[PDB]
Design a protein around this nucleic acid. Structure first.
Ligand SMILES: [K+]
Ligand SMILES: [K+]
Ligand SMILES: [K+]
Ligand SMILES: [Zn+2]
Ligand SMILES: [Zn+2]
Ligand SMILES: [Zn+2]
Length: 156
RNA sequence: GUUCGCGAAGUAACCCUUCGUGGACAUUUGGUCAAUUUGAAACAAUACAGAGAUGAUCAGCAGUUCCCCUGCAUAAGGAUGAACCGUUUUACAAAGAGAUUU
């Protein structure tokens, strides 16, 4: 979230009920962002994957509060969005059929992949398994490179 | 996951609720690249020596080169940037004379 300044309106009614959870997310992100001297490239990437996961989880929590549980008012939701507590573009994808579990927006940026495809993590696990067993090899896909997503198709 | 349709249970019957089941939506990331000795950076350090044309001290500007360095550079600078300094035999014939040989 963005720093509090004269531009910031007071947190709407109900913020204090959710604030402890948002503070735990903040603490986790505050530690993940640190420099940890990871020697290996693989571990280095996995440390950015933790940040992408935490960002997703915080937005997912707020999304569940507003759209699924109706536990917060629209004024609070709009404030959380304005204050960058939740990613509105990612929540916008979660509201669309077939994207209800999208890990991140980067995994659907077709323009940035070599083949113009989405990230492999969008493919339903059943289709990868069928292709692999037909081919006679195990499923080689484990975690995608942009974020450590292991599969985010709505069916999985 | 969502949603459209169907079976079913719950309810007096709808709404609603769950179990089952068909369709729709969403569909292949990344690497020319592994993490200290063995696939390659260099300066420096110790020693000696102390810059071409000079009897002596020097300004230089070039050229040739499968040597380049600094610089944005087609400028300029780098000892006149450096190297240059050695080694060198046959398109080999003609005319004539005096000695050698059968
Ligand atoms: K001298
Ligand atoms: K000179
Ligand atoms: K010069
Ligand atoms: Zn994903
Ligand atoms: Zn992703
Ligand atoms: Zn992905």
């Amino acid at each position: 979230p963005r720093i509090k300044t004269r531009r910031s309106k007071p947190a709407p009614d109900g913020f204090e009920k959710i604030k402890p959870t948002l503070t735990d997310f903040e603490i986790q992100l505050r530690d993940a962002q640190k420099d940890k001297s990871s020697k290996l490239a693989a571990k280095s990437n996995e440390q950015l994957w933790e940040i992408m996961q935490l960002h997703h989880q915080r937005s997912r929590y707020i999304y569940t509060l507003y759209y699924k549980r109706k536990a917060i008012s629209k004024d609070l939701y709009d404030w959380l969005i304005k204050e960058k507590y939740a990613d509105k573009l990612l929540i916008a994808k979660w509201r669309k059929t077939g994207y209800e579990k999208l890990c991140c927006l980067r995994c659907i940026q077709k323009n940035e992949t070599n083949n113009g495809s989405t990230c492999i993590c969008r493919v339903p696990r059943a289709q990868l398994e069928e292709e692999a067993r037909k081919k006679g090899t195990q499923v080689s896909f484990h975690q995608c490179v942009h974020c450590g997503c292991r599969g985010c198709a709505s069916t999985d």
